[PDB]
Amino acid sequence: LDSFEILKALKSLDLLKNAPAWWWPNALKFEALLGAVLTQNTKFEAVLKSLENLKNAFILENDDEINLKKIAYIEFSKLAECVRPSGFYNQKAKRLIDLSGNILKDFQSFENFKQEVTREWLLDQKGIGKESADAILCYACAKEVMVVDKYSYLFLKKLGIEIEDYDELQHFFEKGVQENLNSALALYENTISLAQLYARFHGKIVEFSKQKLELKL
Numbered sequence: 001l002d003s004f005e006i007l008k009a010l011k012s013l014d015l016l017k018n019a020p021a022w023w024w025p026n027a028l029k030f031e032a033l034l035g036a037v038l039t040q041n042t043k044f045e046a047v048l049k050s051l052e053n054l055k056n057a058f059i060l061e062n063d064d065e066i067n068l069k070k071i072a073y074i075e076f077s078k079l080a081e082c083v084r085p086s087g088f089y090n091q092k093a094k095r096l097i098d099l100s101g102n103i104l105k106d107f108q109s110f111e112n113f114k115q116e117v118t119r120e121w122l123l124d125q126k127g128i129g130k131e132s133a134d135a136i137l138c139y140a141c142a143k144e145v146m147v148v149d150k151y152s153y154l155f156l157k158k159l160g161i162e163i164e165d166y167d168e169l170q171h172f173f174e175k176g177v178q179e180n181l182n183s184a185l186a187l188y189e190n191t192i193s194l195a196q197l198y199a200r201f202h203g204k205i206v207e208f209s210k211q212k213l214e215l216k217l
């Protein structure tokens, strides 16, 4: 049992038949960074409601450089009201405002941020945990990072491997792909990058786990 074996098994189930190319809706856009932050300690279905409030108030529109500045400079109580559905709305409003302001300060633009950001820079933004930092790196910045989470932990535990530490759980998932890189890329007929492969692999694990729960299994 390595992660390349798990990737092949999950691939064979066609779990992402109705999903977009990078699994996360609106991947590689500022909206993906916002959802990666808002999903912490909650369910993605609640995040979609917060994102809808942001679009309905015209805080989030079509130009991502403008979107970044709107969050950096928004009135706190206005943002907190919009993000109520995804919970912890005072902490999450402040975390978004501060993160957005620091992206402008250190990188000047969302475009440059996607090129130059590091995981440690994101972890130095107060309140951003490892799952959220890695989801930004993969699904917003197209970096070769695989996100892990409680679902991945429980999924591997059921198969008989318990890795409670986030970075070691991540390294287990990454290294099996790295050690078998030619084979892993051939699953997609060499049409996708390793970053997109990790985007989809984490998506498979989540889709498998959500169904296990709704179907009771």
Ligand SMILES: [Cl-]
Binding pocket: 040, 041, 088, 091
């Ligand atoms: Cl939180």
